[PDB]
Amino acid sequence: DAGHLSFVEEVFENQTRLPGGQWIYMSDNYTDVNGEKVLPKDDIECPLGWKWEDEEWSTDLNRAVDEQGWEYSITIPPERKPKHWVPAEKMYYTHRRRRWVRLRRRDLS
């Protein structure tokens, strides 16, 4: 009767490559949207008092991403990481990432 709070947790799975190379897995390769590291999606836990509403993590194909959910970029000095992502793969693109989301909630009473 008091309602609930809702929060969609968002994390990004990251891959890199050398031009002419292949897309490859890394260690802890998960970051937030700005590229700062975070736990791998499957290790993420609700804060105390919260519960998952979605049973599974999902990736949203309506955003500007390809058919597998990836968006693409390259690192342009002076920067040390990609800043601008695009939906379409091209041979000179060296980074890609995929956005995973999951809804959790907290009942207010």
Residue numbers in the entry: 943 to 1051
List sentences quoted exactly from the publication behind this structure:
Mutations in dysferlin, the first protein linked with the cell membrane repair mechanism, causes a group of muscular dystrophies called dysferlinopathies. Dysferlin, a member of the ferlin protein family, is a type II anchored membrane protein with a single C terminal helix buried in the membrane. Dysferlin is not a part of the dystrophin-glycoprotein complex, but its function is linked with calcium-activated membrane repair caused by fusing aggregated intracellular vesicles with the sarcolemma at the site of injury. One DysF domain is inserted into the other DysF domain, by gene duplication, forming an inner DysF domain and a two part (N terminal and C terminal) outer DysF domain.
A single dataset was collected in a different space group P212121 (orthorhombic) to 2.2 Å. The crystal packing is almost the same in the two forms, but the distortions of the perfect cube in the orthorhombic structure means the monomers of the crystallographic trimer in the cubic crystals are no longer identical. This leads to some of the flexible regions (eg residues 965-671) being more visible in some chains with the orthorhombic data. The structure is highly conserved between independent copies in the crystals. The crystallographic trimer of the P213 crystal superimposes onto the trimer in the P212121 asymmetric unit with an RMSD Calpha of 0.89 Å over 326 residues of the trimer. The four individual chains from the two assymetric units superimpose no worse than 0.79 Å Calpha RMSD over 108 residues for any pair. The biggest variation between dysferlin models is between 965 and 971 and 1018 and 1021. These are also the regions with the highest temperature (B) factors in dysferlin, the regions with the largest RMS between NMR models in myoferlin, as can be seen from the CING database, and the regions that differ most between dysferlin and myoferlin. The trimer (with 9 phosphates) is predicted to be the stable assembly by PDBePISA. We have no evidence from gel filtration or NMR spectroscopy (data not shown) for the existence of a trimer, nor is there any likely way to invoke a trimer in vivo.
